[PDB]
C-alpha cells in the first residue's frame, strides 16, 4: 500500500505543479495588464492561492505516507534483529528489564562521579 499510494500521489503532484505554474502565470499577466495600461478579459481567472495550498496538501500526504513506511520498515528490521506467546512475553520483559538495567547503571554511576 505505501508504495502504491506513493505511485498514486506522484502524477497528482505533477498535475498540481503544472496547474500552479500556469495559474501563477495567468494571475501575474492579469495583474500586469491592470497595472500597466492594458485591456484584459476578466473571465474565469481561477485563483492562485487554492492551487498553492492544494500542492502543499499533496506534499503533506506524500511525506506522511513515506514517514509511515520508513517507520514500519525500520521497525521490522529491528524486530527481526531481536513460539508460545508466553515465551514471547518472557523474552520481551527480559529485554525491557535488561535495557532498563544498562540505563540505570550508566545513570547511577555517571551521577556517582560527581553529584
Amino acid at each position: 500500500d505505501p508504495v502504491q499510494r506513493y505511485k498514486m500521489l506522484i502524477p497528482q503532484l505533477k498535475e498540481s505543479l503544472q496547474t500552479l505554474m500556469k495559474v501563477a502565470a495567468q494571475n501575474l499577466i492579469q495583474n500586469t495588464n491592470i497595472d500597466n495600461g492594458q485591456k484584459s478579459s476578466d473571465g474565469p481567472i481561477q485563483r492562485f492561492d487554492k492551487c498553492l495550498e492544494e500542492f502543499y496538501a499533496l506534499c503533506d500526504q506524500l511525506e506522511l505516507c513515506l514517514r509511515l513506511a520508513h517507520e514500519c520498515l525500520s521497525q521490522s528490521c529491528d524486530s527481526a534483529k531481536h513460539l508460545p506467546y508466553p515465551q514471547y512475553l518472557a523474552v520481551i520483559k527480559a529485554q525491557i528489564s535488561c535495557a532498563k538495567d544498562i540505563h540505570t547503571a550508566l545513570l547511577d554511576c555517571a551521577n556517582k562521579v560527581t553529584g
Binding site: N36, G37, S40
Partner: protein, 256 residues
C-alpha cells in the same frame, strides 16, 4: 471632481452634492437600493482613467474593511468609528465604486474571499450603513449594538484583512528632543515600502527613486510610472507639496 455630468438634470446642485444628499436621505442597508436612485448615466468616465483609478479605489475598500474589522477592539482607526461624517464619505465612495464597477469591473478593489458566492462590496456596505446610522443621529453618541459586533467578528472569517501603511513614520526631532539635553549629531549620520500617494507597492529594496515629505514622511516615487495612463487630477495635486503641507526631499537609493 472627476465625474463630469454629461447633462444637467435637477440643476443648481453639482453631482457631488446630489450624491451627498441622496446618500444622506437614503439610509437603506443594501447598496443596490442606494445605487438605483442616483441617475447612473451621469457617473461615466472614459474607461481609461476609470481603470487607472484602481489603486485609490483599492485603498478605499481596504480601509473600509480594516475599519470594520477593527471595530470589535486604541488603534490606527479608533477615531473613525464614531465620526458620522467620515463614515458618510466612505459610504459615498463605496456607492460610486459600485457604479464604476458596473461600468468597468477592473476598477474595483479586490478582496481575497473565503467563499465564492459572495458580494463583498455589499457586505461591507451593509456593515458600514449599520455603523453610520449609529452616528448620523442628532445629539446621539450611540454605542454600537452587539449584532454589528458579532458580524464584524465574522469579517476575518469571510475576508482577509490585509495590512495598511500609516503615514507619519516619525523621524522628527521635536518628539525626540528634551529640554536641558542637546542632541549632538554628525552630518550625514542620521540617528513593506509603499508609495503612500499613488498606492503602489515598491519592492523590498526599491529600484525607482523616491521623494519623502519632510513633515509627515510619506514616500512617493519621483517620476510617474505610466505617463500615458496617469490620473493627472490626482498626481498633479502633489507636485509642489505633500498633502500635509511639507516639502518633498529626494531620498537616496540604498544599493545593498
Amino acid at each position: 471632481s472627476l465625474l463630469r455630468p454629461h447633462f444637467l438634470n435637477t440643476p443648481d446642485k453639482s453631482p457631488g452634492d446630489r450624491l451627498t444628499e441622496i446618500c444622506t436621505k437614503i439610509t437603506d442597508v443594501d447598496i443596490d437600493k442606494v445605487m438605483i436612485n442616483l441617475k447612473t448615466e451621469e457617473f461615466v468616465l472614459d474607461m481609461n482613467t476609470l481603470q487607472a483609478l484602481q489603486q485609490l479605489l483599492q485603498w478605499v475598500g481596504d480601509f473600509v474593511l480594516y475599519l470594520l474589522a477593527s471595530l470589535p477592539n486604541l488603534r490606527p482607526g479608533h477615531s473613525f468609528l464614531r465620526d458620522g461624517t467620515s463614515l458618510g464619505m466612505l459610504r459615498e465612495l463605496m456607492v460610486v465604486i459600485r457604479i464604476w464597477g458596473l461600468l468597468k469591473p477592473s476598477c474595483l478593489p479586490v478582496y481575497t474571499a473565503t467563499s465564492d458566492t459572495q458580494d463583498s462590496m455589499s457586505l461591507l456596505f451593509r456593515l458600514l450603513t449599520k455603523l453610520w446610522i449609529c452616528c448620523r443621529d442628532e445629539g446621539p453618541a450611540s454605542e454600537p449594538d452587539e449584532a454589528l459586533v458579532d458580524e464584524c467578528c465574522l469579517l476575518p472569517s469571510q475576508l482577509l484583512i490585509p495590512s495598511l501603511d500609516w503615514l507619519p513614520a516619525s523621524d522628527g526631532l521635536v518628539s525626540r528632543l528634551q529640554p536641558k539635553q542637546p542632541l549632538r549629531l554628525q552630518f550625514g549620520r542620521a540617528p513593506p515600502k509603499i508609495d503612500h500617494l499613488r498606492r503602489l507597492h515598491l519592492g523590498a529594496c526599491p529600484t525607482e527613486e523616491c521623494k519623502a515629505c519632510t513633515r509627515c514622511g510619506c514616500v512617493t516615487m519621483l517620476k510617474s510610472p505610466n505617463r500615458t495612463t496617469a490620473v493627472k487630477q490626482w498626481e498633479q495635486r502633489w507636485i509642489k507639496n505633500c498633502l500635509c503641507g511639507g516639502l518633498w526631499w529626494r531620498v537616496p537609493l540604498s544599493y545593498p
